[PDB]
Design a protein around this ligand. Structure first.
Ligand code: K
Ligand code: K
Ligand code: K
Ligand code: K
Ligand code: K
Ligand code: K
Ligand code: K
Ligand code: MG
Ligand code: MG
Ligand code: MG
Ligand code: MG
Ligand code: MG
Ligand code: MG
Ligand code: MG
Ligand code: MG
Ligand code: MG
Ligand code: MG
Ligand code: MG
Ligand code: MG
Ligand code: MG
Ligand code: MG
Ligand code: MG
Ligand code: MG
Ligand code: MG
Ligand code: MG
Ligand code: MG
Ligand code: MG
Ligand code: MG
Ligand code: MG
Ligand code: MG
Ligand code: MG
Ligand code: MG
Ligand code: MG
Ligand code: MG
Ligand code: MG
Ligand code: MG
Ligand code: MG
Ligand code: MG
Ligand code: MG
Ligand code: MG
Ligand code: MG
Ligand code: MG
Ligand code: MG
Ligand code: MG
Ligand code: MG
Ligand code: MG
Ligand code: MG
Ligand code: MG
Ligand code: MG
Ligand code: MG
Ligand code: MG
Ligand code: MG
Ligand code: MG
Ligand code: MG
Ligand code: MG
Ligand code: MG
Ligand code: MG
Ligand code: MG
Ligand code: MG
Ligand code: MG
Ligand code: MG
Ligand code: MG
Ligand code: MG
Ligand code: MG
Ligand code: MG
Ligand code: MG
Ligand code: MG
Ligand code: ZN
Lengths: 124, 150, 208, 138, 83, 104
RNA sequence: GGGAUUGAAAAUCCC
RNA sequence: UUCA
RNA sequence: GAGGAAGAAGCCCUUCGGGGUGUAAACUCCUGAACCCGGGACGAAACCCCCGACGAGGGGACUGACGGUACCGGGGUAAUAGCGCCGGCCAACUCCGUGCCAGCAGCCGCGGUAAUACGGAGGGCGCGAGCGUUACCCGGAUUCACUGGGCGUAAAGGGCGUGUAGGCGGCCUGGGGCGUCCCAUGUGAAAGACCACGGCUCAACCGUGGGGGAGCGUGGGAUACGCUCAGGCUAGACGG
RNA sequence: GCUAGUUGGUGGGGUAAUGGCCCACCAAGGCGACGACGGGUAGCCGGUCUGAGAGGAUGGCCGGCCACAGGGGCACUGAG
């Protein structure tokens, strides 16, 4: 555009949209499980991913992924949300943190223990 | 004498009844680190033959870089296709600040300090040519003198 | 806590012998002697062509693993270097050679740098007369680096300072094997050094 | 109507040297003539001369090039490789002597128009004055 | 009433003052009218007490009122010595 | 120094008061082109001296009324509605742009 | 749940 | 029919 | 810390000849964080008192929360290591388990039996009292482009005019100096940032000194270009 | 599109002091596309982070200014 046009209208700043409306930007947010279930992925995958509909304190009702080999969440578990998508499950934009609240870590896991929140086992 | 650095090797594909029939392309830089570089792009049925052919094409395509103590006499911008390249002179100690493609060319031309920038399309092949051409367009006071002297 | 683990293993990963032990890395046993290929279960297999990145890394890894400095520590120096006037590459090396623990080693009061360090952490060293236990302390030019007045009698001090009797040392240094004192004369130049490292690549690793 | 006579001149020159013309005319004006004095003195152009094409006053600009080259495409090198307008109607560009540009590390030039007359970046620096950054050439 | 007092700089356990001219009501370390000296209580360096006596004399002439500790230092540098 | 501005009187419809239009030129902070902005000041004319088309100097003064901190220092040049007209036309346009239109 | 079929599935067939 |  | 086998056991791998963890460990010698004993701070010299003049000046007395801390001397024990990665980007590979499952996944993508991508193990890479994760800001992003982009077919020329405001404006001369340029000068709090020396054993932290444009105000100056007022001109435009 | 204390005038009241700050009376005026009015959001700054720069983002700690002490209104005392 002409400089006069630029003088006249200027440029428009690029606003970014959040992919994690867990309000207050907040690094994490806690909620209660409303429904614990299984969902099937989209092409080209197949399985029974574990999801949970969480009622957040931010006043939101979003579905969250339950990472890990196995869990212990029912229709009343209080858990902490983390925020992280699951490529295969459209609509799942957050992860449930394992190791906090009613969400047990994952026993037996020995490698990426930090995530999945599993205490270091003693080696005798 | 001459040093060679392989910029990139790709495995292109073509169609025939029956299936795809491949070829390999290779970009090779050749320099004496004394102000002389050459670019060669050789293609062949096999990677080695490709590289070799490339090296061979490179030596046939040389440029005399007006080195002035590890740097370029002046700044220049050259667009080759949709790729643009920016070369800026730099004081010693600066180093060669460039992407892998211009670097390989600059280093073998015997450049030691230079500011650089890849703009537009960053296609290796095309950025490479933009570079050689930038170097090729470099002039010296001595040169400008003979030119405007007349 | 600087590293603290098997060293004649790092020499192996760098394909170049590093003096992390001192007098054993001299007598047919630095492992680099009869077994110079990298560590681990895949050490003798053919090495795939290294990525530009790989090279700039392993290189820095050599230069750092030499002085046994931590990445944090190391990086701060390089930065300080970048800032300062003059060729960052050389200057960076000058600063690295100015670490007390290092000079102590370069003077022969200790065999290796790991040992040179401990001699400093235990006050067995003295800069300009006062005791100093900061291995990262920066020796400026003109400083006298002696041995603890009360540590000259120490067994270990004897051997090293003994084998130092008659044995030229660094052109920027000066050892008075007598009073067990030395003198940081000048900041070494790249020329003064003969390190198996192309600082250029290091500067490039951080350039990224 | 011409909106930027200086830009027009800069262009006639640019355009003519690309086809390697002998001379090339541009409607005369004092200011243009001043630019030319510099181009001439700096050796980008053989020189210039006033003339009267069809009654009206023009300025024959005698272009200049390099020698024939070898290999395919013997076309000589340009003496004027680049010549671009900087300041322009609707976006004039001014500079303080402290803000005068160094075109191609001196291998090039920049013509400013100052209250002390039209001068190259060096001349300007010398009399320590800035002005409208007319254009650059190299 | 404007005063001449000590403003605190330096760090924890490392006090370093600034002999200052400032309105009585300012914070201790607030914006002052002028700096007229500096003082290091621990005498960590040879130069641990400087005072633009000429300026000091100026503010007194106009009404500056020195802290007791401030008056002490000003005198040590003969701000009052009339001999 | 009390500021002194220059402008054209575009109004006399007030008792002892005139509206002076003042233009200002300057390079644009970002796009550099010299742009021209302007403001209207209500100046004090005690003896109803100045009139439309007058180019006057205006000087910073002690308040005289809300929104009226300037007095007419002097007359630069008499009548010249070329400017008053320009301003009047400008405002004329406004008549259009809204819910309706309005012939150009 | 399983076998048939499949590269493995879906479908289909058989318990 | 779906992945490959 | 130094010395320590052609190299323990155990574990992993194997074309079973062997390879790897690995000088790593045992073990020898050496120094001695911790801890014990003793000494112990600077920060505090004023106010006040005496002499002298309630002044200037010598003199004098009181006063430490931090703290029995810092630091100093003596003695003195080998004394925490974790976390994330290893398909490509991206430094780092091999066996078993599992068979579109269980699961991984920043993007591209892995898993339907021989997975360097899932889980474990052995190795390895990277950091290290920390390492990962999530959230947010700038960068890369010339991906709002002033520096520094575009619109025939990739988003993208308004369906076409007319024309208001506005933006822009041939050639020559003169006046004025608005823009522009040049000196000088006043502002521009400290701190921060930059530079140089300094104080805590170093550093972090801190002090002193040095430089500081820009932005505005003021005074003076220049007049090529832009602006403005005057006059002139025909090559733009418009008439006959 | 906005505006009647709205815009200005004369005379008053008031204050340390200018002023539609407030009042009486007289004019009919003032602002707006160079975005008035309206809606949203928000204390501003020295500076901080980032960036080659131009920019972009930001205003914790420390320093400067402002505003407020459950929400609204109001004066008294006083140099304030
Ligand atoms: K081109
Ligand atoms: K001790
Ligand atoms: K269209
Ligand atoms: K003139
Ligand atoms: K009144
Ligand atoms: K802001
Ligand atoms: K800001
Ligand atoms: Mg812009
Ligand atoms: Mg969230
Ligand atoms: Mg799909
Ligand atoms: Mg799949
Ligand atoms: Mg994420
Ligand atoms: Mg290939
Ligand atoms: Mg040449
Ligand atoms: Mg292009
Ligand atoms: Mg692109
Ligand atoms: Mg440097
Ligand atoms: Mg042009
Ligand atoms: Mg050109
Ligand atoms: Mg420009
Ligand atoms: Mg009137
Ligand atoms: Mg009034
Ligand atoms: Mg007057
Ligand atoms: Mg209207
Ligand atoms: Mg079907
Ligand atoms: Mg599938
Ligand atoms: Mg050992
Ligand atoms: Mg002992
Ligand atoms: Mg004392
Ligand atoms: Mg004390
Ligand atoms: Mg007496
Ligand atoms: Mg007495
Ligand atoms: Mg007391
Ligand atoms: Mg790799
Ligand atoms: Mg993983
Ligand atoms: Mg398998
Ligand atoms: Mg694997
Ligand atoms: Mg992976
Ligand atoms: Mg695996
Ligand atoms: Mg640490
Ligand atoms: Mg970004
Ligand atoms: Mg940008
Ligand atoms: Mg974008
Ligand atoms: Mg642009
Ligand atoms: Mg584009
Ligand atoms: Mg289409
Ligand atoms: Mg299109
Ligand atoms: Mg289209
Ligand atoms: Mg069209
Ligand atoms: Mg149409
Ligand atoms: Mg004109
Ligand atoms: Mg100034
Ligand atoms: Mg300043
Ligand atoms: Mg300041
Ligand atoms: Mg020091
Ligand atoms: Mg300072
Ligand atoms: Mg005329
Ligand atoms: Mg009012
Ligand atoms: Mg306006
Ligand atoms: Mg708010
Ligand atoms: Mg950038
Ligand atoms: Mg940028
Ligand atoms: Mg504050
Ligand atoms: Mg309130
Ligand atoms: Mg209240
Ligand atoms: Mg009172
Ligand atoms: Mg009162
Ligand atoms: Zn070794």
């Amino acid at each position: 555009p002409t400089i006069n046009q630029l003088v006249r209208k200027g440029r428009e700043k690029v606003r970014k949209k959040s992919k994690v409306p867990a309000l207050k930007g907040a690094p994490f947010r806690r909620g209660v499980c409303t429904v614990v279930r299984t969902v099937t992925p989209k092409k080209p995958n197949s399985a029974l991913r574990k999801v949970a509909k969480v009622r957040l304190t931010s006043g939101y009702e979003v579905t969250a992924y339950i990472p890990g080999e196995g869990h212990n969440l029912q229709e009343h578990s209080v858990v902490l949300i983390r925020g992280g998508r699951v490529k295969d499950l459209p609509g799942v934009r957050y992860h449930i943190v394992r190791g906090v609240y009613d969400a047990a870590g994952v026993k037996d896991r020995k490698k990426s223990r930090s995530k999945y929140g599993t205490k270091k086992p003693k080696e005798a | 004498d001459f040093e060679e650095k392989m910029i990139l090797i790709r495995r292109t594909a073509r169609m025939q009844a029956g299936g795809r029939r491949f070829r390999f392309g290779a970009l090779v830089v050749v320099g004496d680190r004394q102000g002389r570089v050459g670019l060669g792009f050789g293609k062949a049925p096999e990677v080695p033959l490709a590289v070799q052919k490339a090296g061979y094409y490179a030596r046939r395509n040389m440029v005399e870089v007006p080195l002035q103590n590890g740097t370029i006499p002046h700044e220049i911008e050259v667009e080759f296709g949709a790729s643009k390249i920016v070369l800026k002179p730099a004081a010693p100690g600066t180093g060669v600040i460039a992407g892998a493609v211009p670097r390989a060319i600059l280093e073998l031309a015997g450049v030691t300090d230079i500011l650089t920038k890849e703009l537009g399309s960053r296609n290796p092949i095309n950025i490479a040519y933009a570079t050689m051409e930038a170097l090729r367009q470099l002039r010296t006071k001595a040169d400008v003198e003979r030119l405007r002297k007349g | 806590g600087r590293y603290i683990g098997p060293v004649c293993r790092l020499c192996r990963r760098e394909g170049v012998k590093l003096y992390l032990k001192g007098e054993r890395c001299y007598s047919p046993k630095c492992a680099m002697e009869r077994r110079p290929y990298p560590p681990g279960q895949h050490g003798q297999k053919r090495a795939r062509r290294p990525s530009d990145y790989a090279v700039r890394l392993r290189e820095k890894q050599k230069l750092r693993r030499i002085y046994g400095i931590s990445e944090r520590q190391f990086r701060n120096l390089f930065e300080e270097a970048s800032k300062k006037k003059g060729v960052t590459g050389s200057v960076f090396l000058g600063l690295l050679e100015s670490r007390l623990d290092n000079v102590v080693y370069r003077l022969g009061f200790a065999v290796s740098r790991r040992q040179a360090r401990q001699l400093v952490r235990h006050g067995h060293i003295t800069v300009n007369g006062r005791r100093v236990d900061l291995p990262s302390y920066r020796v400026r030019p003109g400083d006298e680096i002696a041995v603890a007045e009360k540590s000259r009698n120490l067994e270990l001090i004897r051997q090293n300072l003994e084998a130092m009797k008659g044995r030229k040392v660094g052109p920027w240094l000066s050892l008075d094997v007598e009073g067990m004192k030395g003198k940081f004369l000048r900041l070494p130049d790249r020329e003064d050094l003969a390190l198996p490292v192309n600082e250029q690549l290091v500067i490039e690793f951080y350039s990224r | 109507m011409l909106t930027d006579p200086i830009a027009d001149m800069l262009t006639r020159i640019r355009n003519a040297t690309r086809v390697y013309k002998e001379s090339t005319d541009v409607p005369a004006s004092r200011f243009k003539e001043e630019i030319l004095r510099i181009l001439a003195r700096e050796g980008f152009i053989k020189g210039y001369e006033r003339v009267d094409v069809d009654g009206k006053p023009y300025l024959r600009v005698y272009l200049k090039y390099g020698p024939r080259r070898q290999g395919p495409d013997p076309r000589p090198e340009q003496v004027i490789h680049h010549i671009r307008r900087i300041s322009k109607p609707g976006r004039r560009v001014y500079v303080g002597v402290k803000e005068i540009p160094r075109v191609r590390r001196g291998l090039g030039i920049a013509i400013l128009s100052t209250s002390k007359g039209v001068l190259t970046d060096r001349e300007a620096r010398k009399l320590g004055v800035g002005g409208e950054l007319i254009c650059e050439v190299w | 009433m404007v005063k001449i007092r000590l403003a605190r700089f330096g760090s924890k356990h490392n006090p370093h003052y600034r002999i200052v001219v400032t309105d009585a009501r300012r914070k201790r370390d607030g914006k002052y009218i002028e700096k007229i000296g500096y003082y290091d209580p621990r005498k960590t360096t040879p130069d641990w007490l400087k005072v633009d006596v000429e300026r000091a004399r100026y503010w007194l002439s106009v009404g500056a009122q020195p802290t007791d500790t401030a008056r002490r230092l000003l005198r040590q540098a003969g701000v009052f010595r009339q001999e | 120094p009390k500021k002194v501005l220059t402008g054209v009187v575009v109004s006399d419809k007030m008792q002892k008061t005139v509206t002076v239009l003042v233009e200002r030129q300057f390079p644009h902070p970002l796009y550099g082109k010299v742009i021209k902005r302007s403001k209207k000041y209500l100046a004090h004319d005690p003896e109803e001296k100045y009139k439309l088309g007058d180019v006057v100097e205006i000087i910073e003064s002690r308040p005289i009324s809300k929104r009226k901190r300037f007095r007419v220092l002097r007359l630069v040049e008499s009548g010249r509605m070329d400017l008053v007209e320009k301003y009047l036309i400008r405002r004329q346009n406004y008549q259009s742009l809204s819910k309706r239109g309005g012939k150009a």
